[PDB]
Amino acid sequence: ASVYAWNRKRISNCVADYSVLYNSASFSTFKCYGVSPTKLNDLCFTNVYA
Amino acid sequence: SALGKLQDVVNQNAQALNTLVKQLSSNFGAISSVLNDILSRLDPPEAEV
């Protein structure tokens, strides 16, 4: 969808391994604010949104 | 309430300790007031500030 109608998916009951996303050589910009790009598997989030 | 000065000194010490404990749990303009969660979330180069 476009920016005026950006979707929002409330993802829960999820098992996230962000190491495969960061180590993909496909993402140009990975400005990861608030939390470090690495050392992310040692966290356990309440609820995420995409 | 006959002993007023001693009780006042004890209450002042207790209030000082309580204010110190409350300031321990303050953010001071940061992401959180704890250090272990900051170290686990952020990396040292960006969490140093």
Side-chain angles (χ1 to χ4, degrees), chain A residues 32-43:
Chain A
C32 202
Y33 304 96
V35 70
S36 64
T38 59
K39 215 185 300 180
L40 192 48
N41 299 123
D42 206 1
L43 295 182

Side-chain angles (χ1 to χ4, degrees), chain B residues 2-41:
Chain B
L3 306 103
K5 310 192 70 178
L6 313 181
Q7 185 68 28
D8 185 19
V9 166
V10 168
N11 290 330
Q12 281 178 177
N13 295 326
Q15 284 173 358
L17 290 181
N18 286 15
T19 43
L20 197 68
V21 168
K22 289 300 179 179
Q23 287 291 151
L24 180 60
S25 88
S26 279
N27 221 331
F28 299 101
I31 179 167
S32 314
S33 171
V34 300
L35 272 301
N36 42 4
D37 300 67
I38 286 182
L39 288 175
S40 63
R41 289 177 301 177

